[PDB]
């Protein structure tokens, strides 16, 4: 009933990992296509000439599995907007390399992060790859509801967390997304993977994501509260947000390590089962949602 996917950053054996992920009950896996720690060099000798394979083989999975179950993840060291020229040049080559590898496999979607205000060069390199070749892969922007800098523990003695309401300030992650898609010319191939943190922001901040192409929601294990029996659950505020996303029919993604004695998935299924039944209108319109049709002209035309 819920299209759910497991997010991993550690995959030692791809077939074992996928087998366990599917045993858990997930419909897809988000995993790195190269080793997240395997930083590569493209400009200077001798690390430029690093021999041996660059990643694991495409032969390790059926084309059908690469096509339907694997979601690629950009490498965390790739920073096209670094203040260091060499890191931008190297990151440009590595991003195109990683994207073109996922296109070579026909992966249904690839993930890219939005975690700083300036993502100009990342957008230019994405736009450039879109205009290069024949691929049709969906691009997911991993963007948080709240920036890591605004949900940090108030434990820096000489740098404290402000308690003053900054209206526009609290909705900074939406402008990171807005600028990225304005740069990328509103491409239909670029969507949002909205990351939901520990404590929900103001309602206005959540309402900024209304009308936006949210294709997935990322729920870290650390945002789950424990019930009386010991299994993971979510707050009524967090639950409300899940019900909004289920109408939008997003793909739920579970990220992070385990923290409870899969139950994380089973809670979403339970919530999805408990939602209100669709009324006459909602049942009739089921399929017609945001589908543009021409207004009838029964005077001019014969119905």
């Amino acid at each position: 009933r819920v299209s759910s996917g497991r997010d991993l950053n550690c995959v030692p054996e791809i077939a074992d990992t996928l087998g366990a992920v599917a045993k858990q009950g997930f419909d897809f896996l988000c995993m790195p296509v190269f080793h997240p720690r395997f930083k590569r060099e493209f400009i200077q000798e001798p690390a430029k000439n690093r021999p041996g394979p660059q990643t694991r083989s495409d032969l390790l999975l059926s084309g059908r599995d690469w096509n339907t179950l694997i979601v690629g993840k950009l490498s965390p060291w790739i920073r096209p907007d670094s203040k260091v020229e060499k890191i931008r040049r190297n990151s440009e080559a590595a991003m195109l390399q990683e994207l073109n590898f996922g296109a070579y496999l026909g992966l249904p979607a690839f993930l890219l992060p939005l975690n700083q205000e300036d993502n100009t060069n990342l957008a230019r390199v994405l736009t450039n790859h879109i205009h290069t070749g024949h691929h049709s892969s969906m691009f997911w922007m991993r963007v948080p509801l709240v920036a890591p800098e605004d949900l940090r523990d108030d434990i820096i003695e000489n740098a404290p967390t402000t308690h003053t309401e900054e209206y526009s300030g609290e909705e900074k992650t939406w402008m990171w997304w807005h600028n990225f898609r304005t740069l990328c010319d509103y491409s239909k191939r670029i969507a949002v993977a909205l990351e939901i943190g520990a404590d929900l922001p103001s309602n206005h901040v959540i309402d900024r994501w209304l009308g936006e192409p949210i294709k997935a929601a990322i729920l870290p294990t650390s945002i789950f509260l424990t019930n009386k029996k010991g299994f993971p659950v979510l707050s009524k505020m967090h639950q409300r947000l899940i019900f909004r996303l289920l109408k939008l029919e997003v793909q739920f993604i579970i990220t992070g390590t385990n923290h409870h004695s899969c139950s994380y998935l089973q809670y979403l299924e339970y919530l999805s089962q408990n939602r209100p039944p669709p009324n006459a209108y909602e049942l009739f319109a089921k399929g017609y949602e945001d589908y543009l049709q021409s207004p009838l002209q029964p005077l001019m035309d014969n119905l």
């Binding site: 950053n9 054996e13 791809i14 200077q44 690390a47 890591p148 820096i156 003695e157 990220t255």
Partner: protein, 307 residues
């Protein structure tokens, strides 16, 4: 060749000499079918990396991103799986056995540092958190989300058990002290901090390397008049001081080089023996002018620093 693996993964992550002179090796396969890791002990440092000429070996279920000695028998491992691992040598030092594998971080544990006493340790992850551990109790004492990005380096105080340094992609260098209610403080002073090194004599002075190859000398007292040198062309992956009463600073980098510098940061040694990224440095406890470096090229190169 004991009751352990027959092959050691090409990417040599960490080289650590213990008190007697035995060499610790951390390795991971960052390419190919399997992406797992391994731990190795070489009682003969000249026999490394030859898998058949070793004292003991072991297979980790995932890559080794960082490691540290927990005395003379124990070994603390930063895993890609998000686990902090403690592996202890057996009674004969012919086996490496798992003591604890604790999955408490939500992403790749990138850095690990054992605290002055040796009963506690600090881990820094890509999940942005920093954690203080009880090695004996096998739990996390405190969890700290003080950063706004991935933690690059965690370095425990040479002598104070409550103090440590952390640096991150959020451009912060945080001085910690668990005795305060707000444990961290931002060291004032550009480019992202990548490597941290506490000075072994002045418990108030430390060095930091940045993503632009520059190495800088910092005094916690008057955080101005900072001494700096452009040592490397690429990012500085590590800084290790020599055991000498007046230590020498060895700096490893992504430019595939090693350099040994004096107290005024000037260059005295330079080594291009490495063809891939230089990942670690460990000075011999026995021969203080002899320094070892392991790289991503599978080399274990032994250097004789001109002192």
């Amino acid at each position: 060749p004991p009751n352990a693996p027959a092959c050691m993964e090409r990417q040599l992550e960490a080289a650590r000499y213990r008190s007697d002179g035995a060499l610790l090796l951390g390795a991971s396969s960052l390419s190919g079918r399997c992406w797992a890791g391994s731990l190795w002990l070489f009682k003969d440092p000249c026999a490394a990396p030859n898998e058949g000429f070793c004292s003991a070996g072991v297979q980790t279920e995932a890559g080794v991103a960082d490691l540290t000695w927990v005395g003379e028998r124990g070994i603390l491992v930063a895993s890609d799986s998000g686990a902090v691992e403690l592996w202890e040598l057996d009674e004969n030092e012919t086996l490496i056995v798992s003591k604890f594998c604790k999955y408490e971080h939500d992403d790749i544990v990138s850095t690990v540092s054992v605290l002055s006493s040796g009963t506690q340790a600090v881990s820094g992850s890509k999940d942005i958190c920093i954690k203080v551990w009880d090695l004996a109790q096998q739990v996390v004492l405190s969890s700290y989300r003080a950063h706004a990005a991935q933690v690059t380096c965690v370095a425990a105080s040479p002598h104070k058990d409550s103090v440590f340094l952390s640096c991150s992609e959020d451009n912060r260098i945080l001085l910690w002290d668990t005795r305060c209610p707000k444990p961290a403080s931002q060291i004032g002073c550009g480019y992202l901090p990548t490597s941290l090194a506490w000075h072994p004599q002045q418990s108030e002075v430390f060095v930091f390397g940045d993503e632009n190859g520059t190495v800088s000398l910092v005094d916690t007292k008057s955080t101005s008049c900072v001494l700096s040198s452009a040592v490397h062309s690429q990012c500085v992956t590590g800084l290790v001081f020599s055991p000498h009463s007046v230590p020498f600073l060895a700096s490893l980098s992504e430019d595939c080089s090693l350099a040994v510098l004096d107290s005024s940061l000037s260059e005295l040694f330079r080594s291009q023996a490495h063809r891939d990224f230089v990942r670690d440095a460990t000075w011999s406890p026995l021969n203080h002018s002899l320094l070892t470096t392991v790289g991503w090229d599978h080399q274990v190169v032994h250097h004789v620093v001109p002192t």
